[model samples]
Target: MNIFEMLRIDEGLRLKIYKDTEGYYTIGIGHLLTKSPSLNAAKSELDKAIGRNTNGVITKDEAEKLFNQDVDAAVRGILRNAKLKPVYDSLDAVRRAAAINMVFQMGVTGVAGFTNSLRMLQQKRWDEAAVNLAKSRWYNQTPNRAKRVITTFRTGTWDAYK
Candidate 1:
C-alpha cells in the first residue's frame, strides 16, 4: 500500500477544525494550524488551495489536499536530516514507509531522537530496531500505531497496514 493510505489509517481524516490531544488547533489529518507562522496566513493558504473560504469546515477534496501537503512536508523533513537521509535511503520501500510514518506522527527531530533505533535500522537489524522502537515514549502514547510501525520495520511488509 502507499504511504498515503497508511497515513490515512493512522492519522484519520477530519473535515472540520478540532483540537488535537495536546489541544492544538488541528484539521485535515493532523494538520496543526497552530504551528503555522500565522493562523490567518495558514487559513488563507488553505482557502486558496481549496478555492473557497473553509470557515472551519473543509471538503474531502480540501482535506486530501492538506493531507498530501503535510505528507510532502514530512518526507522532505526526513530527507533534510543529514543523518536520516542516508539511513532512509538504505531501507527498502516498506521500511521507508515505516520511517515516513514515524516522521509523520512525530516530526523529523522527534524521530531523530531515536538515535539507537536509527542505528539498528541503518544496520539492518530488524528485530533490534523493532525492540528499540518499542522502548519509546511514543510507543506508550500511541501503542497501536507504534506497534504497526514497529512491525513494519521488523517484517519489511505491509501486513500491518490496516
Candidate 2:
C-alpha cells in the first residue's frame, strides 16, 4: 500500500555488512559503501554510533533509509556509461531487471567481464546466454541464485522464486 512497503519486499531487507557480490564491503540493505573507510575511520564511525557495534549492526529502519539512497546509485552505475547498457535496455522487464540485479550485486565493472554472456545476450541467443552465465565464478559463488537468473534469461519470465 506504500512505496517502501513494496520496495522492501522487492529489495530484501539486510542489516549487516556482506560483500555485495563485488567484494566491496556492503551493509544495511545493499548499501554498497562507495569504498570502505580506513581501519581507523571505520572503527571511529563504528564507535560513534551508540547502539551499533564494530561487527556491523543496524536497525531495519536504518536499512530502509539506506536502501532509498543506494537504489538510485545502483541504477546509475548499471545504466550510465555501461558497456552492456544498450543490450540491457533491449530486454523485457524481467530480463532487464535480472541484468540490473546482477550489476547491483556485482559492480558494473565486474559484470563487464562476462563477455561471453553479454555476447550471447547481444545475439539474442537466450539459451546460450543462460549457459554462459552458468559458466562463471559468479555462478559458482551463487549457484542457486545463478540458476534462477539463468532460467529467467532462458524463459524471459520472472519466476525465480515463484
Candidate 3:
C-alpha cells in the first residue's frame, strides 16, 4: 500500500510541468492561477475564432481544428483534475500543499521532481531536502520573491509567514 502504487502520475507529471530550465512556468487552459499576456492573448484569439460558439469549455478537437495549436485555456472550463490526483493524495498534507503552490506558480509540468537532490523532500529526508531545495533554483521565476520563500522553508521560520 505504498503511495506510488496508488497514484503513479504525480511524480512524473509534476516533473514534466516544470520541464523548463528557466523556472518561470507557462499556464495552460483552465489554469486558474496563471496570468500573462501571452496566454491571455491566445485565449482572446481563440474566442474570436470561435465567434460565439456555445461550447462551455474549449475542446481538443476545437483547438486542433481552429487554433492550429493546442489552445489550453486555464479558466472556468471544466478540466480533468490532473491524472496525478492519486499521487497528491498519497503525500503528507504539508508537502503536498507546497507542491501545489509550486504547481500553481509554474504548471503541472513545471515542478522539478528531483529525487536525489538535497531537496528530495518527498523522500522524507527533511534535513538533506532543505539543503538541496536551496541549491536548486526558484528565483529564475521570481528572484527576490522566490529567495524569500525558499529561505523561509529552509530555516523553518514561521516568522516569514507574518
Candidate 4:
C-alpha cells in the first residue's frame, strides 16, 4: 500500500489522542497500545510493536512505523482469507486498494461481513458494490472517508481522496 493511502485510511496525520479502550492505553495510530513494552508481549506484540511511553505524545514518524507493522498482517489476512482472496487478485488496482484499506481499518473478518457487497463485486456491479460499502456502520462512523473510497471504487480515481 502507498504511504499516502494508508495515511489517509488511518488518518494518523498527527498522534492519535490517547485513550483507554478494550482495557489498554492505545496511542499513535492505534499503536503503542497496552502497558507492556515488548514488541511481542506488548499486547499481543510482534516485531512491529513500538516501545512504550507514558508521555502521551507521538510523532508522525512513529505513527507511520506503527501502522506499517500492523498493516502488513492486515494485507496477509486479505491474501489468506477465502472470501477476500478471489476478489483480492481479481479486482483492478483501485478496487484492490480499497479492499486493503478496508482490511486496515476493519479486518478481513469485518470486510467479510459485507455479504451483499462481495456478491455485487463478484458480478462486477461496481456502483452497487460501492453503495453497499457506504451502507455499513463503518461508513456512518467515517462518512467523508467512506465517500472518498467508495468514489475511488466506482471511478478508479484516487483524486477524490486527496
Model 3 ranges with Cα > 4 A deviation: 1-90, 117-119, 140-144, 147-159
Best by TM-score: 1
Q: Which candidate achieves the best lDDT against the true structure?
A: 1
Write down the worst ten-residue block by lDDT for model 2: 1-10
What count of clashes does model 2 give? Answer: 0
TM-score versus the correct structure, for each prediction: 0.88, 0.73, 0.41, 0.75
Off by over 4 Å in 2: 1-12, 16-25, 33-55
TM-score of 3: 0.41
**Models ranked on TM-score:** 1, 4, 2, 3
lDDT of 2 by residue, 20-111 (tens): 56455556666655456454444445335424564666777776667665566656776784587777877777677677667766778988
TM-score preference between candidates 1 and 2, better one: 1
Q: Write one digit per residue (lDDT tens) for candidate 4, span 27-125.
A: 566553556544334434422354654245556777777777777877789889998888778778877777777776667899988888887887788
Native-referenced Cα lDDT, model 1:
0.85
What local lDDT does model 3 show for residue 76?
A: 11
* Ranking, lDDT, top scorer first: 1, 4, 2, 3
- TM-score-wise, the better of 3 and 4 is 4
For each candidate, the alpha-carbon lDDT, in order, equals 0.85, 0.67, 0.38, 0.68
